[PDB]
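Summary: Need help interpreting a holo structure output

Steps to reproduce:
1. Submit the protein chain below together with the SMILES for V7I.
2. Request a joint structure prediction with the ligand placed.
3. Inspect the structure token block that comes back.

Expected: a single structure record containing both the chain and the bound molecule.
Actual: see attached output.

Input attached:
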Amino acid sequence: WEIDPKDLTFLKELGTGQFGVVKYGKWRGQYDVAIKMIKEGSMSEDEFIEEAKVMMNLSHEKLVQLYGVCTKQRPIFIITEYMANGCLLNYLREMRHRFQTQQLLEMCKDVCEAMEYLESKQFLHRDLAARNCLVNDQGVVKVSDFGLSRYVLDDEYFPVRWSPPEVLMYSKFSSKSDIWAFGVLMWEIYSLGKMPYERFTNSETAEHIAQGLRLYRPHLASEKVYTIMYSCWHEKADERPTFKILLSNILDVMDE
Ligand SMILES: *CCC(=O)N1CC[C@@H]2[C@H]1C[C@]2(C)Oc1nc(-c2cnn(C)c2)cn2nccc12
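--- attached output ---
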């Protein structure tokens, strides 16, 4: 699970994330990698290192592969697959792409395939959103930072706009909490990176979600697509669908 830091050649800074900067680089001077440098005091480092053994055993084509960690020094490095086209939210807000509805549905399929893998492994993301998704050189969307919310040491960390009512009121996390977030993620894609509940503050959003407010139908979304995303927002969690069911629904629409 340990990667030698010297086998990394640092090339370009990519930006900043929740735990610090991310740099582009070569591993043994041949394979592209992303090097996440974790700011000291921002991660429960002992717990993350034990969990990394589980995360490295998660292999799926639509899951951002974790190649290993560099923990012998501080700050520690997280070495992941490189995603040439960056964060999904920024990709969606780039209007030059002139996206077709089918491309948006493929992004939804990509995430749904990855989340079905995780559901099969009993692994919860706990923060599914377009900001935690990355896009590669071929337009493939992949899910990133799955489960990392459990190791953030900042108290103010909360993703209210992606949270079902039982989480906002009781902190009851489950597979159904990820399902709700996926419904919001579909809305984000069909709204081209629009913030969920754009007219409300984080406090008003939860107040309205308790009263029963639901996201509206994005302009680029058909009735059938909206139906899939609205299914993720049933007030009773037990009534929300499985990632297996959502994938079958997306493939049905993709074929039609
Ligand atoms: C939407 C949230 C966001 O802006 N980020 C979360 C992850 C970090 C930023 C994007 C960054 C810096 O991580 C990565 N960025 C790229 C990237 C950005 N621009 N180009 C041309 C590439 C590529 N990555 N591969 C893995 C992680 C990142």
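--- end attachment ---

Reviewer comment: The longest helix spans residues 101-120. The chain is about 35% helix and 15% strand.
Status: needs-info
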